[PDB]
Every structure is written in C-alpha cells, then in structure tokens.
Amino acid sequence: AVVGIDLGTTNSCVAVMEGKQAKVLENAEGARTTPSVVAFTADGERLVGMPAKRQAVTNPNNTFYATKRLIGRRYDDPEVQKDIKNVPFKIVRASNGDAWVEAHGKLYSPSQIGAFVLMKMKETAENYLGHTAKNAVITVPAYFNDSQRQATKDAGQISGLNVLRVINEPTAAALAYGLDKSEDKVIAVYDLGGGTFDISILEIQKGVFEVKSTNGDTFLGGEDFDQALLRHIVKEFKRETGVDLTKDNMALQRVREAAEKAKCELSSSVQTDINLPYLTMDSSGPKHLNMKLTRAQFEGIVTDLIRRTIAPCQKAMQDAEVSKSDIGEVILVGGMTRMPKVQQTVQDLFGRAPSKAVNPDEAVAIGAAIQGGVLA
Numbered sequence: 001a002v003v004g005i006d007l008g009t010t011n012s013c014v015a016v017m018e019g020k021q022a023k024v025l026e027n028a029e030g031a032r033t034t035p036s037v038v039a040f041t042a043d044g045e046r047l048v049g050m051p052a053k054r055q056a057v058t059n060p061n062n063t064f065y066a067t068k069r070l071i072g073r074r075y076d077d078p079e080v081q082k083d084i085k086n087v088p089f090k091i092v093r094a095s096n097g098d099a100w101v102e103a104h105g106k107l108y109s110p111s112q113i114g115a116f117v118l119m120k121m122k123e124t125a126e127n128y129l130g131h132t133a134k135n136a137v138i139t140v141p142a143y144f145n146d147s148q149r150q151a152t153k154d155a156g157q158i159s160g161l162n163v164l165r166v167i168n169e170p171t172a173a174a175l176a177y178g179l180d181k182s183e184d185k186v187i188a189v190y191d192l193g194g195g196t197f198d199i200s201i202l203e204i205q206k207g208v209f210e211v212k213s214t215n216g217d218t219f220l221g222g223e224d225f226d227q228a229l230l231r232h233i234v235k236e237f238k239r240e241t242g243v244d245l246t247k248d249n250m251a252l253q254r255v256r257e258a259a260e261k262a263k264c265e266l267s268s269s270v271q272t273d274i275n276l277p278y279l280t281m282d283s284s285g286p287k288h289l290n291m292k293l294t295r296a297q298f299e300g301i302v303t304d305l306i307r308r309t310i311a312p313c314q315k316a317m318q319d320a321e322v323s324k325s326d327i328g329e330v331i332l333v334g335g336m337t338r339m340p341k342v343q344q345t346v347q348d349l350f351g352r353a354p355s356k357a358v359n360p361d362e363a364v365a366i367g368a369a370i371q372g373g374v375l376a
C-alpha cells in the first residue's frame with residue numbers, strides 16, 4: 001500500500017487508497033492536517049506539528065516554518081533572499097551553496113526539516129494502517145525544478161519512505177475531483193493555502209493532464225490573513241485598555257491563534273467573539289480580551305490580500321492563451337478558499353461558480369493517494 005503525502009508549505013496531509021475510495025488519515029490528536037513546523041526549544045527538545053506551531057511566536061528564533069520556500073534552492077536564489085527578510089529564524093549558506101537553516105548552532109537542510117514533518121505523517125499513516133509504511137507518492141508545486149523535486153524525494157528517504165513518484169499539486173488536486181474521467185476540458189486550479197498562492201491552468205486531454213500555465217505569489221497565504229487580523233486586534237486592544245501586547249510574545253502567541261480561529265469561524269458565521277482571559281495584567285489586576293468581529297469587518301481587514309490573487313490569475317489565463325469563457329471548471333484548493341469573499345473573487349475571476357466538491361485542504365493528499373494506488 002502506498003501513502004499519498006501533501007508536504008505543504010504551512011500544513012501537511014496524508015491519505016491512502018482504501019477500496020475505490022481514498023481516505024485522509026487523522027493523526028493521534030484527531031487532526032486531518034499537521035502543521036509543517038519544526039522547532040527546537042531551549043531544552044533542545046524537538047517539536048513537530050501542532051506542538052511546534054503552538055510556540056512559534058514565543059520561540060521565533062528557533063521555530064522553522066515555510067521551509068518549503070528553501071528546499072532545493074541555492075542560498076543566492078532571489079526567493080531565498082526574499083525569505084530571509086520575511087522570517088525571524090536564521091537562514092544560512094551551506095558549504096555546498098544551498099540554503100539551510102540554523103538553530104542553537106545546529107545546521108539543518110530543508111530536506112531534514114521536511115523529513116521531520118514526513119516522519120510525523122509516516123507515523124500517522126502507520127497508526128491507521130497497523131503496519132509500517134514504506135512506499136509513498138509526494139506532491140510538489142508545479143513550478144518546482146528538478147533540484148526542488150530531488151530534495152523533496154530526499155526528505156522522504158531520510159524518513160524511511162521510498163518515494164515512488166513526485167507529482168504536481170494542481171494535478172493531484174484534479175485527480176481528487178475526478179477530472180481524471182472528465183471529457184476534455186480546461187481547468188483552473190485556484191490554490192490559496194496557509195503560506196502560498198498558486199493558480200494553475202490545466203488541460204484534460206483523454207484523461208491526461210497538461211499544465212498550460214502557472215502563476216501566483218509564494219508569499220501570499222492564510223498566515224498573512226491571520227497577521228492582518230492580529231494587527232487589528234493588537235491595535236484595538238491597546239486603544240481599549242492602553243496595554244501594548246507587542247511586548248509580550250506569549251500574549252501575541254495567544255492572539256495569533258485566536259485570530260486564525262476567528263477567521264475560520266467567519267467562513268460559516270457572520271460574527272464571532274474573540275475571548276482571551278488573563279491575556280495580560282495591569283495595576284488594576286488581570287486584563288481579559290473580549291472582542292466581537294463581523295465578517296464585514298474581517299473582509300475589510302484582508303481585502304488587499306484577496307485582491308492580490310487577481311492579477312496572477314489573469315496573467316495565467318493570458319499565458320495559457322484562453323479567455324475566462326474557455327475555462328470549463330474552477331477547482332478550489334487550500335483552506336483559505338473556504339472564505340466566502342475568496343470564493344466570490346474566484347467567481348468574478350472566471351465567470352463560473354468554483355467547484356467546492358472536494359475538501360479544499362485535503363484534495364492534494366487525496367490525489368497523491370489515488371496516484372499511489374495506481375503505482376501499487
């Protein structure tokens with residue numbers, strides 16, 4: 001049996017072919033996705049997944065996130081240099097010219113950081129399978145070159161996985177939607193995840209996919225929506241109480257989590273309450289944070305982020321030499337696509353209601369598992 005792993009910028013997901021239906025596997029914590037985050041504390045204990053995510057704000061120097069931006073890339077790559085200016089952890093030039101990360105004077109390749117995450121996904125699968133997992137299909141963005149693909153394969157190898165194939169994310173997503181069995185058609189894959197935005201224009205010809213064009217923004221993702229809201233919360237709180245939370249990393253840790261939670265609630269509700277008891281303390285005693293946030297308010301806060309998905313999409317269509325009319329179906333990938341205003345932007349972009357049929361953040365792993373089943 002061959003597992004399908006989406007080793008994502010922000011989050012990862014593992015699925016496997018069970019019958020004629022793929023199944024996304026929950027981890028021990030009951031979570032269908034696992035944060036692609038690896039941290040090393042003062043103790044030097046290693047945290048992976050949610051335990052690591054939970055301390056990313058209080059341990060910014062030694063928490064590695066979005067290392068997928070580094071994997072397979074030379075230190076001197078522009079995108080690595082851009083990454084350096086956006087993350088608080090240390091990125092270093094390895095002896096061999098590659099971009100690695102450092103923490104507590106220890107050096108790790110992005111393949112090593114990936115391997116920590118994959119070991120967690122491998123355990124998750126084995127915990128369901130009841131036997132060791134060896135064979136895997138791993139997904140990568142369509143734009144990955146051979147070097148990035150090879151580094152991703154090496155990540156899997158380190159973890160004890162034989163990566164039978166590396167396949168592209170938009171293709172994996174297309175498989176999950178069954179486009180495999182569709183009549184010839186042009187497909188837009190609109191992919192807004194936690195860390196990056198991708199738009200792919202694919203064509204299905206006789207059941208086989210072709211990537212006509214690709215575009216996006218590697219530095220536009222759900223995390224930025226969370227940060228925009230956290231910024232609002234911090235400003236509002238300071239006005240409300242006089243207290244500046246930017247000085248307390250622990251409070252910010254709690255606000256960033258509450259902001260993400262708020263954003264997700266506003267996809268199904270028009271108002272949400274942000275509540276953080278004993279967030280800080282004053283000469284009057286404990287201070288509690290209590291804030292109502294409407295979907296209209298949240299939309300206002302992140303409108304620029306959403307609009308940034310527009311131009312990349314128009315260019316992708318121009319590069320694929322099609323008009324909106326020529327596109328037969330838009331599929332949504334990435335948890336962010338659950339946001340109503342994002343869905344509306346996608347609709348305005350392509351002149352059709354996007355397809356919501358498959359779980360947005362499970363589509364890629366499901367596709368991976370389908371391709372796995374074939375390979376097996």
Ligand SMILES: Nc1ncnc2c1ncn2[C@@H]1O[C@H](COP(=O)(O)O)[C@@H](O)[C@H]1O
Nearest residue numbers: 011193194222264267334335336338361
């Ligand atoms: N129901 C939801 N509403 C809004 N955003 C969500 C929802 N579920 C997940 N997300 C976001 O989508 C991103 C996860 O996408 P991915 O990286 O593809 O797993 C994260 O930034 C989440 O905050």
